[PDB]
């Protein structure tokens with residue numbers, strides 16, 4: 001791909017984070033904490049899952065960023081509407097305002113409803129995410145495999161401002177403690 005020149009500097013929004021997440025000082029890394037991280041509750045925080053939003057809101061244009069997923073067993077990545085549900089149980093789907101892919105139990109899937117199997121020969125250590133607002137496109141790229149395409153959501157109905165979306169996943173196994181990191185431009 002040749003989307004690198006639309007690179008944007010993403011930072012994480014503390015206020016949206018599940019209360020167990022630890023966001024680095026530079027707001028570029030996030031990981032699962034051992035316990036509750038001693039923050040007050042608020043209506044923005046994702047309550048049920050280890051999720052956080054980027055601070056940036058996009059309503060036009062083309063945007064690109066990259067995320068490091070090295071040594072994780074489980075995670076979700078993509079974009080979502082600013083108005084997505086924060087509290088309780090929900091599925092990641094375009095009907096609920098999410099355009100995402102994930103790793104879970106040694107398989108990669110796109111967050112369609114129902115979910116779509118992805119075909120990845122080279123497990124990625126870094127993921128590229130491209131959003132074309134006007135075109136209604138969200139695409140995912142395997143940076144470890146020379147930028148190969150993972151998945152394209154087309155005919156997207158964003159229906160609002162978009163925010164970068166992250167889920168570090170649970171760490172029931174003791175093998176998923178590693179952070180998500182926003183990679184430098």
Ligand SMILES: O=C1CN(Cc2ccccc2)CC(=O)N1
Pocket residue numbers: 018020032047048049050169170171172
């Ligand atoms: O990885 C974990 C975290 N988990 C707490 C938790 C629940 C809901 C949302 C965020 C955090 C408990 C557990 O058993 N392991």
